[PDB]
Design a protein around this motif. Structure first.
Motif, short mmCIF file in Angstrom:
data_model
loop_
_atom_site.label_atom_id
_atom_site.label_comp_id
_atom_site.label_asym_id
_atom_site.label_seq_id
_atom_site.Cartn_x
_atom_site.Cartn_y
_atom_site.Cartn_z
N UNK A 32 3.42 14.91 3.70
CA UNK A 32 2.54 14.79 2.55
C UNK A 32 3.21 13.71 1.68
N UNK A 33 2.52 12.59 1.45
CA UNK A 33 3.09 11.46 0.69
C UNK A 33 2.82 11.58 -0.82
N UNK A 34 2.06 12.60 -1.19
CA UNK A 34 1.70 12.88 -2.58
C UNK A 34 0.48 13.76 -2.68
N UNK A 35 -0.06 13.87 -3.90
CA UNK A 35 -1.25 14.67 -4.17
C UNK A 35 -2.30 13.85 -4.89
N UNK A 36 -3.57 14.20 -4.67
CA UNK A 36 -4.71 13.54 -5.30
C UNK A 36 -4.86 14.03 -6.75
N UNK A 37 -5.80 13.44 -7.51
CA UNK A 37 -6.10 13.83 -8.89
C UNK A 37 -6.42 15.32 -8.98
N UNK A 38 -7.22 15.85 -8.02
CA UNK A 38 -7.61 17.26 -7.97
C UNK A 38 -6.54 18.18 -7.33
N UNK A 39 -5.42 17.60 -6.91
CA UNK A 39 -4.30 18.34 -6.34
C UNK A 39 -4.29 18.56 -4.84
N UNK A 143 -1.51 -3.39 -7.48
CA UNK A 143 -0.89 -4.40 -8.34
C UNK A 143 -0.83 -5.78 -7.67
N UNK A 144 -2.01 -6.39 -7.44
CA UNK A 144 -2.17 -7.72 -6.83
C UNK A 144 -3.34 -8.40 -7.53
N UNK A 145 -3.02 -9.25 -8.52
CA UNK A 145 -4.00 -9.93 -9.37
C UNK A 145 -4.91 -8.92 -10.04
N UNK A 170 -3.46 8.53 -5.82
CA UNK A 170 -3.68 8.12 -4.43
C UNK A 170 -3.12 6.71 -4.16
N UNK A 171 -3.41 5.74 -5.05
CA UNK A 171 -2.93 4.35 -4.97
C UNK A 171 -1.41 4.32 -5.09
N UNK A 172 -0.86 5.04 -6.09
CA UNK A 172 0.58 5.13 -6.33
C UNK A 172 1.31 5.74 -5.12
N UNK A 173 0.73 6.79 -4.50
CA UNK A 173 1.30 7.45 -3.32
C UNK A 173 1.40 6.50 -2.13
N UNK A 174 0.32 5.73 -1.86
CA UNK A 174 0.27 4.75 -0.77
C UNK A 174 1.29 3.63 -1.03
N UNK A 175 1.25 3.03 -2.24
CA UNK A 175 2.16 1.96 -2.65
C UNK A 175 3.63 2.40 -2.60
N UNK A 176 3.94 3.62 -3.09
CA UNK A 176 5.30 4.18 -3.07
C UNK A 176 5.80 4.33 -1.65
#
Ligand SMILES: CC1(C)[C@@H]2CC[C@@]1(C)[C@@H](NC(=O)[C@@H](CC1CCCCC1)NC(=O)N[C@@H](CCCCN)C(=O)O)C2
Ligand SMILES: [Zn+2]
Ligand SMILES: [Zn+2]
Ligand SMILES: [Zn+2]
Length: 305
Positions: A32-39, A143-145, A170-176
């Motif tokens: 599990x790379x993280x959690x969504x807004x709804x958990x 974080x690209x333009x 979701x974006x932060x989890x993928x990027x991290x």
């Protein structure tokens, strides 16, 4: 009940990520790379034969909720990997030499919403200040333009860039994940629908990448390989050049991190069914897409860096 030839809800996909890992422990591991807004847990499958200092290919599906064929393709890729490993020369070599980080559903909250309330939902399901309008476009949140022309500053819009770059969990989890495994990741692949198009950087501005000639030739050859099966016609090129300005995309962000092989695959069809691609087309769409993905994989393997 899970089926590779049918669209499966999140409860079924989540149960499948656990079952496919347990049934194939020498080829698949799940984190599990993280959690969504709804958990909800954002699951990632590491597909490949374990070994030391292995290069990797990152692939995500379901960044956009309504693009059901993309979620179906990530499952089909895993299906192919476990079925043909040890039975087909190319897939065997790929899983031995590389690892595939397969993210079956990035925007889980949006995906649940397409099954329960609105089939045509695109964005995340996060709240926005000063409005009752919901969601951010994850493919305008990297974080690209970030939040330039082609992204919207309006939270009620389908291309809303978010409050800040990586504002979405979701974006932060993928990027991290990519930042933490950057030295191993050699290719980034984002699966979407529809238009039958292969996009490569850049989409955040009208500019050609450093290896434009190489990416043009690779996309041309991948499009050619895809067409051999059913004659399905795909167009290709730099994002801003052949599609439209789409800043804050995962593919452009991954490219600027040093991942020089970065592609967005817009699957079937061309507008007849659009996002509502019939289940009867899953098999054909996935099998032809496999040829393009395997061509790119083989190329990456022969051009390690
Ligand atoms: C008006 C819109 C909300 C706007 C443009 C067409 C839309 C329907 C929507 N775009 C979409 O819903 C789909 C499908 C559309 C079908 C009709 C023709 C145009 C495409 N494309 C998409 O998300 N592309 C990715 C491409 C990413 C490449 C670089 N990372 C993206 O924009 O994130 C976005
Ligand atoms: Zn999409
Ligand atoms: Zn097959
Ligand atoms: Zn070469």
């Amino acid at each position: 009940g899970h089926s590779y030839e049918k669209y499966n809800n999140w409860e079924t996909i989540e149960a499948w990520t656990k079952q496919v890992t347990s049934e194939n422990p020498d080829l698949i591991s799940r984190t599990a790379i993280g959690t969504t807004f709804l958990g909800n847990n954002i699951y990632l499958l590491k597909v490949g034969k374990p070994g030391p200092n292995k290069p990797a290919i990152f692939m995500d599906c379901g960044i956009h909720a309504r693009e059901w064929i993309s979620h179906a393709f990530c499952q089909w890729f895993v299906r192919e990997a476990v079925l043909t490993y040890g039975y087909e020369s190319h897939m065997t070599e790929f899983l031995n030499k590389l690892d595939f980080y397969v993210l079956p559903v990035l925007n889980i909250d949006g995906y649940i919403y397409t099954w329960t309330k609105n089939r045509m939902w695109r964005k995340t399901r996060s709240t926005n200040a000063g409005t009752t309008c919901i969601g951010t476009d994850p493919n305008r949140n990297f974080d690209a333009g970030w939040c330039t022309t082609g992204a919207s500053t309006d939270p009620c819009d389908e291309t809303y860039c978010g409050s800040a770059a990586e504002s979405e969990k979701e974006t932060k989890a993928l990027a991290d994940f990519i930042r933490n495994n950057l030295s191993s990741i050699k290719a980034y692949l984002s699966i979407h629908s529809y238009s039958q198009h292969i996009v490569y950087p850049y989409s955040y501005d009208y500019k050609l990448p450093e290896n434009n000639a190489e990416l043009n030739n690779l996309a041309k050859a991948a499009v050619k390989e895809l067409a051999t099966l059913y004659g399905t016609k795909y167009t290709y090129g730099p994002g801003a050049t052949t599609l439209y300005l789409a800043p804050g995309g995962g593919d452009d962000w991954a490219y600027d991190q040093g991942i020089k092989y970065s592609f967005t695959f817009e699957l079937r069809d061309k507008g007849r069914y659009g996002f509502i691609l019939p289940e009867s087309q899953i098999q054909a769409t996935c099998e032809e897409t496999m040829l393009a993905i395997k061509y790119v994989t083989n190329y990456v393997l022969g051009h390690l860096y």
